[PDB]
Amino acid sequence: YQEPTDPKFPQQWYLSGVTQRDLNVKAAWAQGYTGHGIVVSILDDGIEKNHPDLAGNYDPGASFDVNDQDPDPQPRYTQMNDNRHGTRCAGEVAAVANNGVCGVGVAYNARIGGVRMLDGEVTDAVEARSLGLNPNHIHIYSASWGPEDDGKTVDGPARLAEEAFFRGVSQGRGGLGSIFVWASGNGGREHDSCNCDGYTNSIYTLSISSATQFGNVPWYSEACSSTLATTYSSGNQNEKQIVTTDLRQKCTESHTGTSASAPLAAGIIALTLEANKDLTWRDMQHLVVQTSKPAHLNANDWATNGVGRKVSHSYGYGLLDAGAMVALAQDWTTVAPQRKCIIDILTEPKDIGKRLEVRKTVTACLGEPNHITRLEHAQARLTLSYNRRGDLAIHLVSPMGTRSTLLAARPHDYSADGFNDWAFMTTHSWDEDPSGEWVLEIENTSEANNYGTLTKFTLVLYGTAGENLY
Ligand SMILES: CN1CCN(c2ncc(Oc3cc(CN4CCC(CC(=O)O)CC4)cc(-c4cc(Cl)cc(Cl)c4)n3)cn2)CC1
Ligand SMILES: [Ca+2]
Ligand SMILES: [Ca+2]
Ligand SMILES: [Ca+2]
Ligand SMILES: [Ca+2]
């Protein structure tokens, strides 16, 4: 093994660094893990398949054009370079190494393709065809975009896309499950809260946020309990950005946003799959939880959960660590079957007013085939009316004491439409025992006299049984 010689590798500070402020990818490469045999697809505006740093790794079997309904995902060229983003993301995953061009991908021996889906009308059918592309050939899908990041939107997949996600995790990859990597959002300036985005908020997606070079929460970041982990991206004008392939056969040093973090995670996941090709979609989320690193990430909300892990709403479990992912993958025993325990909490609607607390002691399906002693995801599916939605903050506390913020105040959200059976999701209680008293808190964070009613609260627990060793 020799370190890459590509001319811009030194500028890929999140890979080439030697000050321990990086993704620890060199450690994985040094053990011989570079993505060989793994297939990744970028869901975006197209991929410049003839780019000098992509052609060597390009895979037509990982690619399709859902906008035009043909196999060739080549983007359209315009003066504003609108359709450059899929190419930038593709190079982050799998730019060719040691070829005198630009830098390298995280998984520089993986195969890379793209779905051209964003250069046209994005419909339920378009989303389903993209998420469901060749699921026994593609291992990992990377999506950097979704519903509007205006801080006012609540939106998620419709029926066909939801079914594609479920079919992907259940039957993709020969039954191991498609791995869907998602960017948690770019709406930080607008005070967006990412559990309002049903793609990143899904249990089926492995959601990723960003850290700046100096280890801070970037201006564009969205906090939420559904995020799992973090990779480096852009920040202020003293901090470096992401260096990758660009449209028109170029190299950029100015790729930015959480949309640049998801592809780096997809690349790390490709190295991990090469290390253990038998990992399921759930195994991969377990590995991320166990191995990600809070060290040197600054946040004001780090808290230790019931099993002793530090977690943040900006960062999830912390920075991805490629060396640690590959090491744990080699020792991992695949997890037991997923159980799902549905608990109807309310006996009657509850006035919200200024503040509401709902407490319920649960058994997590004790005595039944879906009894859960080892939690993975948890959802609170809430139906509520309120006069000004963005004034609400919502928290969920587990029996072991872990407080998850399900919704922070969104000052720009003046909707009067409330939430209709919306499944706010938290990863912060992973591995906890969910038996005991849960607490839901709903608060009006404004001085206004706001009003509404909580009409349904369904607590949904996922996980496994067996002795909980935490
Ligand atoms: C510079 N770039 C310009 C283009 N851009 C962009 N981003 C995002 C974009 O809208 C969207 C919108 C959605 C939301 N959904 C909800 C259900 C609706 C059903 C219906 O009514 O039929 C249809 C719309 C989802 C997605 C999406 C994105 C990916 Cl990557 C993968 C999947 Cl699966 C879904 N995308 C449109 N353009 C990114 C920035
Ligand atoms: Ca085409
Ligand atoms: Ca290169
Ligand atoms: Ca958002
Ligand atoms: Ca997710």
UniProtKB/Swiss-Prot annotation:
Optimum pH is 6.0. Residues 1-465 are lumenal. Ca(2+) 1 binds at residues 6, 53, 96, 99, 101, 103. Ca(2+) 2 binds at residues 65, 70, 72. One of its GO terms (molecular function) is metal ion binding. Residues 335-465 form the P/Homo B domain. The keyword rRNA-binding does not apply. Keywords: Autocatalytic cleavage, Calcium, Cell membrane, Cleavage on pair of basic residues, Disulfide bond, Endosome, Glycoprotein, Golgi apparatus, Heparin-binding, Host-virus interaction, Hydrolase, Membrane, Metal-binding, Phosphoprotein, Protease, Repeat, Secreted, Serine protease, Signal, Transmembrane, Transmembrane helix, Zymogen. Residues 12-326 form the Peptidase S8 domain. Disulfide bonds join 102-251, 194-224, 341-365. Inhibited by the not secondly cleaved propeptide. Inhibited by m-guanidinomethyl-phenylacetyl-Arg-Val-Arg-(amidomethyl)-benzamidine (m-guanidinomethyl-Phac-RVR-Amb) and 4-guanidinomethyl-phenylacetyl-Arg-Tle-Arg-4-amidinobenzylamide (MI-1148). Inhibited by Decanoyl-Arg-Val-Lys-Arg-chloromethylketone (decanoyl-RVKR-CMK). Inhibited by heparin/heparan sulfate-binding. One of its GO terms (cellular component) is Golgi membrane. Ubiquitous endoprotease within constitutive secretory pathways capable of cleavage at the RX(K/R)R consensus motif. Mediates processing of TGFB1, an essential step in TGF-beta-1 activation. Converts through proteolytic cleavage the non-functional Brain natriuretic factor prohormone into its active hormone BNP(1-32). By mediating processing of accessory subunit ATP6AP1/Ac45 of the V-ATPase, regulates the acidification of dense-core secretory granules in islets of Langerhans cells. (Microbial infection) Cleaves and activates diphtheria toxin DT. Interacts with FLNA. Binds to PACS1 which mediates TGN localization and connection to clathrin adapters. Interacts with LAMP1, LAMP2 and LAMP3. This is Furin. It comes from Homo sapiens. The lineage of its organism: Eukaryota, Metazoa, Chordata, Craniata, Vertebrata. The gene is FURIN. The chain holds residues 110 to 574 of 794 of the full protein.
